[PDB]
Structure 1
Amino acid sequence: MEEVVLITVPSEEVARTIAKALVEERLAACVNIVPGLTSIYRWQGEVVEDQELLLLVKTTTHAFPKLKERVKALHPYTVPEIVALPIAEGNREYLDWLRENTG
């Protein structure tokens, strides 16, 4: 089954490097980089704020384990956000393309 994976990154350099690696390695068919995020989260009991970018990764459920391994290898954070949202339905031509361009 196809999924849209969300990944937040600290900079455009990390956004581009991870985005390119995932597509190049066939772990994703496409990756969108959304810039300008202001992120507020908890870290060791403190609430902190930082500027980030969001990656939207179009991939499949069986590509997830390797995708995670590669993202962790490239991401500067010890616990990076990598969460997959299920694609309940989509246009057939697109889903076929996604499948054909992954794995």
Structure 2
Amino acid sequence: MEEVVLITVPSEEVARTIAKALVEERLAACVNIVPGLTSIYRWQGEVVEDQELLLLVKTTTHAFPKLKERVKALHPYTVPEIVALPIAEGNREYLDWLRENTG
């Protein structure tokens, strides 16, 4: 039920705006921003490159639907990367804090 959601963004500005918005709105309890990424992906049968930052979002499956909505709104690109990885287990007290602070 708890999840670590990955989202990449084009700038520190967007990274912080999204991280703050998600935590403020209780759609996530914690968000880690990892700067300096190089992203290589396919677009129109063409391999392109971009500079990005990674957001690691600690949330839940119940908040995810709302999280996607808020992210698509704040994110500048039409089809933003938003993928959730399941949390199999962890520090019990940490996960409780995670649920306790997510809506």
TM-score tier, shorter chain, comes to over 0.9
Structure 2 gap ranges (5+): none
Query: Structure 1 unaligned runs (5+)?
Result: none
The 2-side partners of 1:66 and 1:97 are apart by 19
3-state SS, counterpart of residue 39 of structure 1: strand
Once the two structures are superposed, what CA deviation does each residue of 1:18-47 show, in whole Å capped at 9, x if it has no partner?
A: 000000000000000000000000112111
Take 2:20 and 2:33, find their aligned partners in 1: how far apart are those partners?
A: 11
The residue that corresponds to 1:92 in the other structure is: 92
Q: Say if 2:27 is the partner of 1:7.
A: no
Taking only the aligned residue pairs, the percentage that are identical comes to: 100
- The count of corresponding residues between Structure 1 and Structure 2 is 103
Deviation per CA, 1:50-98: give whole Å up to 9, x if none.
Answer: 1100000000001000000000000011110000000000111000100
Give the TM-score normalised by the residue count of structure 2: 0.99
Aligned counterparts of 2:48 and 2:37: Cα–Cα separation in 1 = 14
| 4+ long deviations beyond 2 Å | none
When the two chains are superposed, the root-mean-square deviation of aligned CA atoms in Å is: 0.5
Secondary structure of residue in 2 paired with 1:62: coil
